[PDB]
Design a protein around this nucleic acid. Structure first.
Ligand SMILES: [Ca+2]
Ligand SMILES: [Ca+2]
Ligand SMILES: [Ca+2]
Ligand SMILES: [Ca+2]
Ligand SMILES: [Zn+2]
Lengths: 616, 309, 77
DNA sequence: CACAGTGCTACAGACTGGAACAAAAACCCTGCAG
DNA sequence: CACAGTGGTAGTACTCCACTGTCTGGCTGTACAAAAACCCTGCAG
């Protein structure tokens, strides 16, 4: 039987059928090799018909894959942290032994890639963007942006890589086309109609990172600290044709997750030195400023449609909020980024203030400090300008950061407990010896009951586990006085009562009663602090206690949320950055930022995360 | 446009084609429609096929797949550094789309390796070892080795784990059986005979490792530095019946590789202090010093054979 | 990477004196040529000549150390 | 003279196509053989 | 009131190893008509 001989062997057999199919291809199709054999064989198998093969023969060509489709292979490789070379190892293994290979080769995965990265879909900005090129196919650009490397100027030491802003925007926006059209159908809105009234709200974050080791390479020399600038799409809603203040279509269900945080720019720069950070990150701010005005026109769902963008920079820590706005940092006399009170007026009256600071007034105050029209002395001009000693570089929405606020308050209560173990308000001047002894007994008691090893620095998780009532009642037994016990216990209770207003995604729905009583509860909190703990809070408050006892109701009223705009998305993305610089990038100084950027853009797509569930 | 019409139009689109095919089958191959129509695709596609033509054509009734043996799946999982939960994610995704499931579930892998780990094969020493129990199924044993944790003594601040020496050795030797049999074959020495004089030379190594971060956990408090005792089978040779110092069979071609270094004991202990290190590592050195004397008996390649170390 | 010869060539350029520039290069040469005996897997096969010459080469290395670097290797080895 | 990778790029071998050839595998078929 | 994990164990839920008859859906030889959609041509502005 011919099924036992080689494929070369068969030469003599099928000559006449090849002649017949070549003659037949002319008169009806023109060269269609596939169909003339496909519809013949699939139907001739069903002549003596068992359906066992009818399933195998139906999906063989068109839908879907046969084997698993290349896009499914790409998703099951990116979303499980499989290195390319490990995947090729698995591919060879599953194919050579009993295959019938299922996965696709590497070079066809790499070909289904150029559709996901930016620089593939066409778009149009109306009107034309200001001092921004109109070419829509730019991929990964080097962040140096044309430095005249010549030796006599400032050196070009910094390596950097970045997409263009609008191109990554339109790609990460067209990726959500599935869910935007499904929201359009769910709300049952008109499709052909109401195409130009969309509105996008986008949270962007910035952050630095320490002790990133460096490599030998070939140069140039580079610092260890790395800086990562990334953005995330929070919500997309519709406006036309009337007032209809909000008609949401898509809202990110989990804004703090890794899976929704899109990297835009990576640098090997320190955060401290302003010169290099501003030189590299200048073009991004110019793109943002020129993009806030114009409207995007994108082909989605079969039709071209017009979008507008709204940016809210909220993912910055206080060090960077003060750097990017020129204020002095951070143990300064002026504690609040939003208000103008000094340390004294904020230890005196804790719970009454109003938000004033913004971008435009800070620019104008730098102008006043520089022109100095009244010939004032330095120390008093500083008070007249209220801490603006530098020109603001970038606009950030006036909001509080959740995670570092929780950490600040947890370190504050940890210091209070330490003071309490010993008697601090009887003997006001202790030594370092007794301080270390009190800290040691506090850590031993916390480890014995709460199951918490000591910490070098207060990370978020130790701050969630420390400020709970079990821990306080585990430290209440150490403090001998029976009145201080009740005091700090009611303090912890008030704090646990006011926490979910700021730490929740939407306090307006998940915890309305705690929202309604935040002002009064903070009043009682500050009253207990002023009364009983005055030995510690006479004239010195931390800047986070002020932010959380004065400005929280106004913040949650302005936008409607706090924790949903936290810096979690970037902080946690740093983990992905480290695991992608060690496992998935070329080991060289020249190329490796490009690989981390590409793989981290692929991990954070929605279209490749649709296949991880595959309808359960 | 030939994309989606039903049967009874392609019927008369290809009536003459199928009549000619049946005529050819009757003229030369008797008339077996299936064998003809299955082979029609081979040459028509192969004029220009990429590679997937051959795969989807060999996807015929033969093969076949139902999926790889669970051992191959286990090897893929332990050699691509895939976490168990990530592997289950891959399994669910590959079965839900177009499956036809290939990979095995987790619960059949968990019983698939019960042979590879120690404490499975039967073995016995002679003469019986000193100060070592004869149970041959001891798996992962806690290294503390019966410390009377009671408060007044020196406390047990150490979390450690270790395989017993003899059991991990007989499993690492029973695993290399393929290569020692193949060496006997290539060397053209008789397999059944002169099986009593083997000799196994084993390189052992001990090392510490700094700044292993501690966990919150329950207790007790533990230092951060860890110590990792491991060993590796360097070479195995034959001497019997004699006249040769040795006749080598298996020699590790890549001794320094990370693929050939078998861990034996893990501890959370500092290297500087001596009392904790020696109290944990007492038993290992004891049964090692007691093992150099006697000879091991294993059932390998079908027969009972004797080993020295 | 630093024990190779083309690396001693980048250092010999900073040393102003010439006799020392030759001395340290002769030292690097002797070392590159006695290293593979104890770094190789099986020196009895891959490099037999270096194994046969290790005694004389070590003698000469020690002689050069005592001669032109005595100020450092008087009593600390 | 650690060693298993770290991904992208480059070019080596595996394919067709008729022309035509040889060697071989093995049926069957004739010569010369008792 | 982050969040996606980390592997093992107990529990539920289901989907199957064998015996059995019965049932429907869909294959095959041409004949027979109803719809499909251009294209012709026919008669009219
Ligand atoms: Ca940081
Ligand atoms: Ca920082
Ligand atoms: Ca050490
Ligand atoms: Ca060491
Ligand atoms: Zn304020």
């Amino acid at each position: 039987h011919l099924l036992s001989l080689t494929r070369r062997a068969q030469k003599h057999r099928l000559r006449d059928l090849k002649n017949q199919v070549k003659t037949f291809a002319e008169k009806e199709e023109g060269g269609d090799v596939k169909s003339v054999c496909l519809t013949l064989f699939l139907l001739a198998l069903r002549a003596g018909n068992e359906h066992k093969q009818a399933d195998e023969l139906e999906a063989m060509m068109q839908g879907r894959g046969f084997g698993l489709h290349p896009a499914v292979c790409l998703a099951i490789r990116v979303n499980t942290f499989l290195s390319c070379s490990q995947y090729h190892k698995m591919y060879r293994t599953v194919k050579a032994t009993s295959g019938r290979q299922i996965f696709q080769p590497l070079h066809t995965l790499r070909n289904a890639e150029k559709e996901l990265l930016p620089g593939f879909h066409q778009f149009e900005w109306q009107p034309a963007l200001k001092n921004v090129s109109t070419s829509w196919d730019v991929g990964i650009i080097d962040g140096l942006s044309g430095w005249t490397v010549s030796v006599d100027d400032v050196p070009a030491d910094t390596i950097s890589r970045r997409f263009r802003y609008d191109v990554a925007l339109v790609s990460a926006l067209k990726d959500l086309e599935e869910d935007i059209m499904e929201g359009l159908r769910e709300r049952a809105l008109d499709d052909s109609m109401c195409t130009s009234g969309f509105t996008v709200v986008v949270k962007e974050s910035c952050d630095g990172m320490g002790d990133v080791s460096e490599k030998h390479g070939s140069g140039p020399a580079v610092p260890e600290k790395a800086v990562r600038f990334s953005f995330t799409i929070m919500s997309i809603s519709i406006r036309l044709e009337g007032e209809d203040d909000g008609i949401t279509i898509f809202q990110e269900q989990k804004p703090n997750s890794e899976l929704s945080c899109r990297p835009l720019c990576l640098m090997f720069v320190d955060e401290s030195d302003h010169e290099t950070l501003t030189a590299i990150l200048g073009p991004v701010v110019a793109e943002r400023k020129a993009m806030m005005e114009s409207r995007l026109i994108i082909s989605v769902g079969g039709l071209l449609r017009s979008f507008r963008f709204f940016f809210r920079g909220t993912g910055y820590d206080e060090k960077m909020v003060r750097e990017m706005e020129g204020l002095e940092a951070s143990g300064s006399t002026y504690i609040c980024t939003l208000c103008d009170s000094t340390r004294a007026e904020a230890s005196q009256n804790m719970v009454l203030h109003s938000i004033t600071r913004s971008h435009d007034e800070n620019l104008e105050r730098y102008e006043i400090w520089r022109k100095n029209p009244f010939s004032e002395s330095a120390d008093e001009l500083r008070d007249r300008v209220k801490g603006v000693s530098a020109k603001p570089f970038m606009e950030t929405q006036p909001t509080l950061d959740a995670l570092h606020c929780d950490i600040g308050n947890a370190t504050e209560f940890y210091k209070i407990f330490q003071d309490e173990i010993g008697e601090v308000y009887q003997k006001p001047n202790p030594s370092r010896e007794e301080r270390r002894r009190w800290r040691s007994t506090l850590d031993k008691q916390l480890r014995k009951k709460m199951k918490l090893k000591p910490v070098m620095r207060m990370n978020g998780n130790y701050a969630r586990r420390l400020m709970t009532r079990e821990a306080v009642e585990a430290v209440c037994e150490l403090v001998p006085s029976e009145e201080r016990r009740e005091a700090l216990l009611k303090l912890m209770d008030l704090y646990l009562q006011m926490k979910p207003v700021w730490r929740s995604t939407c306090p307006s729905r998940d915890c309305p009663d705690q929202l309604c009583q935040y002002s009064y509860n903070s009043q009682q909190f500050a009253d207990l602090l002023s009364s009983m703990f005055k030995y510690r809070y006479d004239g010195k408050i931390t800047n986070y206690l002020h932010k959380t006892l004065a400005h929280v109701p106004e913040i949650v009223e302005r936008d409607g949320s706090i924790g949903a705009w936290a810096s979690e998305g970037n902080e946690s993305g740093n983990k992905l950055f480290r695991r992608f610089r060690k496992m998935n990038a070329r080991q060289s100084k020249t190329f490796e930022l490009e690989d981390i950027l590409k793989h981290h853009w692929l991990y954070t797509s929605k279209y490749l995360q649709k296949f991880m569930e595959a309808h359960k």
